[PDB]
Amino acid sequence: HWGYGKHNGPEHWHKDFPIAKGERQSPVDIDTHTAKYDPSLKPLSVSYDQATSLRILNNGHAFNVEFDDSQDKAVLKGGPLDGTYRLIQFHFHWGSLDGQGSEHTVDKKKYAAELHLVHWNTKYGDFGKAVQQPDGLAVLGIFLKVGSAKPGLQKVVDVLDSIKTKGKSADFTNFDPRGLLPESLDYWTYPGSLTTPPLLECVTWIVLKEPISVSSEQVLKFRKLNFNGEGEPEELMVDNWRPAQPLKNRQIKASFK
Ligand SMILES: NS(=O)(=O)/N=C1\NCc2ccccc2N1
Ligand SMILES: [Zn+2]
């Protein structure tokens, strides 16, 4: 089954998921000089004050923090988006070393990690129907660099010891995702895909320009997670990122001049 190793990683995914070679795959390199400021982009609106987190799960590929999405609690609106997109989960991608780990790159620069806040378009009723639509999803991507600790991340770091292996979960109520955001909401946007199988081309990507800083100790704890299940040989959960894919017939737009 798919993963990030030499025998099941990104270069192999196309055999089971032919869309891997499609026309709007993600991630991409963001060439900052070619991206064009779009004065038509409406203001972006991140409304996370009523977010209701539920649980944290090691799914064998990353860890997901899951939210109650049965009502408009935590939503993303504005920017390139029409209507309202509900937060369903967030997760990260990260490296074995601080010099890699992000999926998107900025003028070919790799960050140490990348946070994905995944949202679905409420016009389609449920996530499963949304991922059959070209405008079904919006993912807010945030780069992580190593420097000072991010206080709003520490509650995540401290629960990781309880979900070390694939299939383990833990209660994760009362987590506030506002604590994961940088100061600025300046962003780049483009149409793309999920970056893990099934690689569905449903996503409006919104990638923030400003990274958050996390401490070396915080990212080191990500790297102590395991891809394997309990009782199986230990394989550290590191380098769970897909590299940049061809931009093809797309333009990246900037919200800022
Ligand atoms: N890295 S990503 O683009 O968020 N990929 C994702 N997100 C959420 C999801 C849900 C179900 C199946 C696959 C995926 N893949
Ligand atoms: Zn992701």
Side-chain angles (χ1 to χ4, degrees), residues 2-5 7-39 41 43-49 51-72 74-76 78-81 83-122 124-128 130-144 146-154 156-160 162-208 210-223 225-234 236-247 249-256:
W2 73 267
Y4 293 97
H7 305 284
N8 62 359
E11 301 300 320
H12 290 272
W13 293 350
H14 73 99
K15 292 173 278 172
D16 272 350
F17 306 95
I19 202 176
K21 295 175 183 279
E23 297 298 302
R24 57 174 276 185
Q25 290 289 292
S26 295
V28 299
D29 181 56
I30 300 168
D31 188 84
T32 63
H33 294 106
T34 302
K36 192 183 181 184
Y37 169 65
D38 189 336
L41 287 168
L44 188 72
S45 175
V46 184
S47 301
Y48 286 172
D49 47 297
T52 302
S53 64
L54 294 173
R55 191 180 70 145
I56 190 172
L57 170 70
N58 178 335
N59 61 23
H61 312 289
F63 63 86
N64 290 351
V65 174
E66 304 158 350
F67 290 79
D68 175 5
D69 65 348
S70 61
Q71 304 178 258
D72 288 328
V75 305
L76 187 63
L81 305 173
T84 297
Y85 289 69
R86 281 179 197 165
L87 178 64
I88 181 166
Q89 54 106 323
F90 71 77
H91 62 272
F92 303 79
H93 305 264
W94 61 92
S96 53
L97 305 164
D98 295 349
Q100 62 186 31
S102 66
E103 294 204 311
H104 295 87
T105 57
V106 179
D107 297 328
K108 302 292 175 82
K109 176 189 174 69
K110 294 172 168 78
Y111 286 91
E114 186 174 330
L115 166 60
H116 291 161
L117 295 126
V118 180
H119 312 75
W120 58 271
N121 191 331
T122 63
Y124 303 120
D126 72 64
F127 178 90
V131 301
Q132 304 175 54
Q133 318 302 328
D135 60 350
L137 300 182
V139 183
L140 182 59
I142 305 179
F143 296 118
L144 281 60
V146 173
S148 67
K150 191 69 166 174
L153 183 59
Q154 189 60 33
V156 173
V157 165
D158 284 330
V159 80
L160 297 183
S162 76
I163 60 152
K164 184 180 180 186
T165 53
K166 178 174 51 65
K168 296 201 124 47
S169 67
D171 184 285
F172 208 67
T173 49
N174 306 110
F175 178 77
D176 189 345
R178 292 176 294 188
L180 298 173
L181 306 179
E183 289 180 357
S184 178
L185 295 178
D186 282 347
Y187 65 87
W188 298 282
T189 184
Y190 75 97
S193 74
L194 300 177
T195 71
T196 56
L199 301 170
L200 300 174
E201 291 182 338
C202 312
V203 180
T204 302
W205 276 95
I206 299 168
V207 178
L208 298 190
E210 185 183 338
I212 61 166
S213 294
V214 304
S215 67
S216 55
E217 293 89 349
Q218 289 178 319
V219 67
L220 283 163
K221 292 177 176 193
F222 285 17
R223 299 183 186 131
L225 289 164
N226 287 180
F227 284 126
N228 53 283
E230 182 184 4
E232 297 164 14
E234 186 164 19
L236 295 175
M237 184 178 282
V238 295
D239 293 319
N240 58 351
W241 51 278
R242 191 190 194 190
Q245 301 300 305
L247 189 58
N249 185 37
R250 291 178 286 183
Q251 289 183 328
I252 303 181
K253 296 301 191 181
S255 74
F256 59 93

